[PDB]
Homo-oligomer: A and B are copies of this chain.
């Protein structure tokens, strides 16, 4: 038995770690420039701004910050994905809850994430985590973040979790709270909902992919919005044949 190909890729391969180091190298270069020349706009969309016409929360004079998704963006949930590969019960919500409470010693940093977070703090940039881990598991999540070498997160100040408001897995509310306190100059994530809820809750697989190429959205990638790979679970693992293989690009062997 080999693990699922996506987990071989993400957790086993040098290809995936090189991909992750690349994201954080670009992020650190971007943050350094914005520390020297403060932008007018932050990288967090204004409330009511749609994907057909993106607009952003002003940077103002607010203290500089970077916002990170947690799972598979700064921290690899190796123990849980081991359980999923061994048992085939990755979709078990009670197992994931147990993992939030007890997985502390089975996480690793995403390659380059521990180094990136130290550099941001040396630069005077506040590191803020916005994750859909549950509020009631804030203390074990704090411990897992620290165990992954990512420093000290504080619930309600530099850590925001699902349940901190009544929006569920929608992260726009927490993003608005963060953007009201900080000038967020970089934001990292492995899922499109780590940048805007507008990618989810409706849009199809093909619509979401097209939305990443809307010009005002496309300009963000590697330039304020920084992406980490996740072919293992979540919103990238959707679609039938007609949405994955467009019908003008099909072919049959002899």
Contacts and interface: CB of A to CB of B under 8 A. Distances in A.
Contact of A12 (B15, B80, B85, B243): B243
B5 A205 contact: no
Interface of A: 1-19, 21-26, 29, 78-83, 85-87, 89, 92, 94-95, 98-99, 102-103, 105-108, 111-112, 190-192, 199, 205-206, 208-213, 218, 221-223, 225-232, 235-241, 243-246, 249-254
A102 B212 contact: no
Contacts of A243: 12
Contact of A15 (B9, B112, B227): B227
A31 to B, nearest CB: 13
Contacts of A29: 29, 222-223
A106 B250 contact: yes
Contacts of A2: 239-241
Contacts of A239: 2-3, 8, 12-13
B23 A222 contact: yes
Contacts of A228: 19
Contacts of A12: 205-206, 209, 236, 238-239, 243-244
